Ligand binder design. Structure first.
Ligand SMILES: [Zn+2]
Ligand SMILES: [Zn+2]
Ligand SMILES: [Zn+2]
Ligand SMILES: [Zn+2]
Lengths: 195, 198, 197, 197
DNA sequence: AAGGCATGCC
DNA sequence: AGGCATGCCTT
DNA sequence: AAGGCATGCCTT
DNA sequence: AAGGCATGCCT
């Protein structure tokens, strides 16, 4: 099967927010509204903001999961490539083969789905700090979109799911991702190609 | 290391908690504690008084352990140790091994431990009742690298976890505080408290 | 792993030299040799003819071994092998182990060695004297990763070392050449020669 | 004792030239004529030019050595700090303890002096490439001047000696070095400090 | 690149 | 100690 | 197949 | 930082 990518704001009015960081050639992470697509560097901080209109009950969780965007690849599990899965870059919390990690959260939980084989990463939902209007999660993507024998130049979507403590769905959003060496340059290229 | 210790405050059955002197915020005061951040700012090798408060005295053989861990989860599995320079300095107090970040000063019964499973350093003294007239037990800690030390803490913040333990080493109580070991404790304290309010 | 095998040229008693076809320099020529660099430029999995020239014929049972090594000293002790991706590729020729960078095509008497003491890989075939009117023996090698493969040669130059050896594995002669396995052998040879002068 | 730092051109007219790289904040390497001082980043290329009026014999060598500049530190051997000594920054040729390396010269040699324990790096002298008038060596400095447990904010000199094959001196030149994060910034600051208001 | 600031030292 | 010495971040 | 582009990385 | 270049892939 294929996990749903249907936007669902749900009862908490759950939306995603991004930092608008421009298009300098090698900016670490930038987001393109035209494309609803994140462009980021391998292993670097990728902030994603969680915006809600009302606070979810305690025990709420936030899951991220990658799937290939193109229909002919959707059934293939998105994983790190054979080279990077073997690299010495463990943070001591994440599985070597998971593409998406969360950094900065000791309560992070990774899953290898026993039936789908799909990887995901889950953290508990915490409301914004005082004064803040949104909750920021810092993701890292641990292969380039180009990785031979991994994503192998295929676009992926990251699906962000808000879940109750047992995994029932409360909210869903998604964005496309390109992990590459030069996010600003590649953001500009894809955008210009869209004209 | 492959695991991390708890930082969960645990008063336990003796009502265990920590107390800190009120100190300056003068640029380079040798040790100053921020209640807003629950964070100690201090200079390398300078006295850090930490007060132990209990509601009733624990049994003889009770011990007090201090251990350092990285605050950031992405570094938390890594053992906090001295940098290559300071490890090789000739600054022993007579008992402390050269690789240990935290020393206790002024106590003959101090012991330094390397965990053989976790590899983690800690320093442990026997627990003493507060002196006659006093309400708490003051221990004098030192930190033997700056937070900035290259090849050591390397600008990564740490927490010090203080545990009350029985003689076999089971937990009686736990508290913790962040530490920055820096050149200008008063300056840095204020900078960080200012940042809170932004 | 282990120490570096000698790369010293040793023509020996049989006058052992190598020779290479005088190929193209068009962008993506499958295989081209630069006399100036003593360097082959070739594509992944494409035929790389290598000529054996001896002044005098080696005895029955002589064998021809090739083995790759990193050119550079910091890299010399590391075994040249295929990157994790290509090693797990379904590209067997039926005979070569999947980790081996260097294959021989067209030769059912090929053997592949995983050296138990050095961990180094090599591929060896029986020596055959030239046929009739031919002045050399040609072996067709294939290189199964690009020089650039991350997790493998990772942009680090290699040498291939061809040894002539007796039926017992004793050295008879030795030659070597540098290799770059890349997408566009012609372009990259031009570039590299250009940069030399 | 302390090695001599006194400049002399000697019989080959031996002198150093530097590149004039300007003072942008983060320029890799830049040189101050007014200070006879090179400002450079840790581990980056520092080009140093050898100029001679006549060609010394082959077997002629060019050695580089750091000493502390201040008279009270002079007798202390200049070395990397414990942290950088330990880092994984090896080129496979240089000893981990040596501040000064030569990059891009496979003939480099390092010395630990048996009497003084001072470090040095030496390369054969080679004549200018045809159509050029000087020989360039690429030095790397492998600690910052500010490195705690190494130079610890003490200025140093590099002494470049032209030597015959016995190590007899043919020519000497020296210059101050500051290894720092922002050479351009720091050269500016230091030259501004030469001024009277 | 080159603004911004962290952090040692005076 | 405000002012500087000097490192490292990201872009 | 030369020309153009995709895309990682180094330089300053 | 954008420029430049290494180096795979394509039309
Ligand atoms: Zn990868
Ligand atoms: Zn230290
Ligand atoms: Zn490969
Ligand atoms: Zn250093």
């Amino acid at each position: 099967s294929v996990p749903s990518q249907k936007t669902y704001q749900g009862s908490y009015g759950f939306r995603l927010g991004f930092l608008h960081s421009g298009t300098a050639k090698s900016v670490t992470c930038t987001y393109s509204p035209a494309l609803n697509k994140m462009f980021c560097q391998l292993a670097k901080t990728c902030p994603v903001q969680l915006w809600v209109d009302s606070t979810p009950p305690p025990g709420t969780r936030v899951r991220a999961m990658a799937i290939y965007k193109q229909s002919q690849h959707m059934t293939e599990v998105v994983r790190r490539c054979p080279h990077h899965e073997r690299c010495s870059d463990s943070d001591g919390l994440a599985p070597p083969q998971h593409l998406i990690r969360v950094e900065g959260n000791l309560r992070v939980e990774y899953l290898d789905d026993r039936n789908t084989f799909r990887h995901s990463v889950v953290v508990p939902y915490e409301p914004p700090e005082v004064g803040s209007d949104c909750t920021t999660i810092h993701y890292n993507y641990m292969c380039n979109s180009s990785c031979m024998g991994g994503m192998n130049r295929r676009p992926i979507l990251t699906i962000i799911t808000l879940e109750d403590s047992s995994g029932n769905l409360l909210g869903r959003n998604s964005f496309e991702v390109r992990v590459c060496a030069c996010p600003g340059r590649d953001r500009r290229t894809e955008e210009e190609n869209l004209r």
